[PDB]
Chain A
């Protein structure tokens, strides 16, 4: 189950 959000660098 993937993380719901991924922040950009």
Chain B
């Protein structure tokens, strides 16, 4: 199926002394593969997956130079935005940037993206066509004008449709043993009595990859949303993911209820029942 490469960058200003805290992370699909943290000792881009260790010293020197350049743009941005919004030097502020590309089952370019936020609110984003910009307010509009005069969109489009796609394909090949492998959810169901009248059924999905999954309940063959609780999908810590969904039912009626699991690692969706 489809794949993605995405980079995420956060800078947080430190009023009173020194430069902002800067943290960069890179992902292929749901797998982290690189990081840079300005508070760490190395001041280098670091590997976070075994398959990226295949890359030579020139790659690591080049990514390091680029990630530091990213960090310096963010430092400057924090000063400019404080000016744009007439804010003081006292408070801590945040910039966030995300960019990357998607490819379909044929590993050809599908979509590209590049978005930016200031203090957790939309600031400016490249549109889907990769030709123009969405500016949220009048500050972002000034930036839009700057970037239009300098043809920034043109530079990004070239990266997102070219280099991004090229290197994602490269990563997918080098990391094929994990990156191109699906792990099906390991499912089971638990039971709790709340009182003499009421029971909780909880349907578990564990050890799955990628993160995308659907868990639903049915009663006598029809979808049930009322009296259900579905937790956010959460990392196990070993590269795989976890999720559950629970339903509250009248004691003795457990048999009416079935849990249904959809995941790319399952050719057929699966059904579970109590007892």
Identify the A interface with B (CB < 8 A): 1-9
Binding site for A on B (CB under 8 A): 7, 26, 63, 66-67, 69-70, 73, 76-77, 80-81, 99, 116, 123-124, 143, 146-147, 150, 152, 155-156, 159, 163-164, 166-167
How far does the Cβ of A1 sit from chain B's closest Cβ, in whole Å?
Answer: 4
Interface SS of chain A: helix, strand, loop or mixed?
loop
Residue numbers in A under 8 Å from B70 (CB-CB)? 2, 6
A-side contacts of B166, CB under 8 Å: 1
Interface of B is mostly: helix
The docked-state distance in angstroms from the alpha carbon of A8 to that of B11 is 14
Residues of chain A with a CB closer than 8 A to B143's CB: 9
Closest to B34 in A: A2
Contact at A3–B81, with CB atoms within 8 Å? no
Report whether B164 and A9 are in contact in the complex, using a CB–CB cutoff of 8 Å. Answer: no
CB distance from B169 to the nearest CB of A (A): 11
CB pair A8–B77 under 8 Å, yes or no, is yes
Please, could you name 17 A-B residue pairs with CB atoms under 8 Å apart, sorted by A? A1-B163, A1-B164, A1-B166, A1-B167, A2-B26, A3-B66, A3-B159, A4-B66, A6-B70, A6-B73, A7-B73, A7-B146, A7-B155, A8-B80, A9-B80, A9-B116, A9-B143
Contacts of B167 in A (CB 8 A): 1
